[PDB]
Paper text:
The data revealed glycosylated proteins that adopt a lipocalin fold, bind lipids and organize to form a tightly packed crystalline lattice. After ingestion by the embryos, its increasing concentration in the midgut facilitates the crystallization of Lili-Mip.
Additionally, several crystals were solubilized and recrystallized in vitro. Amino-acid sequence heterogeneity was observed in the structures determined from all three data sets.
Author numbering: 1 to 153
The structure:
């Protein structure tokens, strides 16, 4: 489903700096790729860094990424594979998570991505994410988790 982005949502400088875990998406992409870790460093208003993930074909792999930021949108570019390369629009930004949405070749009808500061986000963070999704006309129940990451005994 296409979101209804906030009209005056600002993307503050260096808000994306550091390590993030991509743990929840719509549609569910985690049969295709899992254990996604992002690390971003600031370069002016833009970002550069690395994404590591587990590929069914390649096992644990690493890629260099660039984020080119313009207002509430950014261009995501990966160095050695381009199925996720797209413009992405920020839908929500918080100290504990951020959400954006784009239409990469891997999911051309739309892909919502939720990135967390925590590998296994606590209940209170997920509840905030649920509320943020509703605020941009999305629904958490239509998202899928990375079940390959052990967040429960
Ligand atoms: C899930 O993703 C995490 C994050 O990438 C993986 O943890 C990382 O695993 C690699 C390989 O075991 C570690 O690399 C090692 O780093 C040391 C220091 O740089 C180096 O000397 C070794 O030769 C090796 O390159 C990496 O440190 C480690 N990171 C963390 C934070 O633990 C994990 O393996 C992935 N698991 C699955 C099942 O995909
Ligand atoms: C896309 O970006 C990734 C991540 O930066 C690149 O992976 C890197 O590839 C180089 C080879 O070009 C690897 O160098 C290797 O280092 C190991 C020690 O770790 C050593 O055995 C050799 O000297 C070898 O040359 C480097 O480790 C590797 N980095 C990571 C984090 O995996 C990849 O090459 C880039 N691809 C393209 C097409 O630009
Ligand atoms: C994705 O993971 C979250 C977190 O584990 C799930 O939300 C929890 O679901 C369990 C039962 O599945 C409930 O007991 C918790 O109360 C839920 N937490 C919150 C904050 O609502 C979510 O259901 C998972 N989604 C899918 C599709 O499996
Ligand atoms: C905002 C998007 C950031 C998340 C990107 C998800 C990371 C997934 C990375 C790589 C997925 C695998 C690439 C596609 C597989 C084909 C590669 C090949 O056959 O050589
Ligand atoms: C971003 O991409 C440019 C290519 O235009 C590259 O030279 C640079 O190393 C990347 N990272 C930055 C600018 O932090």
């Amino acid at each position: 489903k296409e979101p209804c982005p906030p009209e005056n949502l600002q993307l503050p400088p260096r808000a994306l700096v550091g390590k993030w875990y991509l743990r929840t998406t719509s549609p569910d992409i985690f049969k295709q790729v899992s254990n996604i870790t992002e690390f971003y460093s600031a370069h002016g208003n833009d970002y550069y860094g690395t994404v590591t993930d587990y590929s069914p074909e390649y096992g644990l792999e690493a890629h260099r990424v660039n984020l080119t930021v313009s207002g509430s949108t950014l261009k995501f570019y990966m160095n050695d594979t381009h199925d996720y390369d797209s413009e992405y629009q920020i839908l929500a930004v918080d100290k504990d998570y951020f959400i954006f949405y784009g239409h990469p070749p891997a999911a051309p009808s739309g892909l919502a991505l939720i990135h967390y500061r925590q590998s296994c986000p606590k209940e209170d963070v997920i509840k905030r994410v649920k509320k943020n999704l509703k605020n941009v006309c999305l629904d958490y129940k239509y998202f899928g988790n990375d079940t390959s990451v052990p967040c429960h005994y």
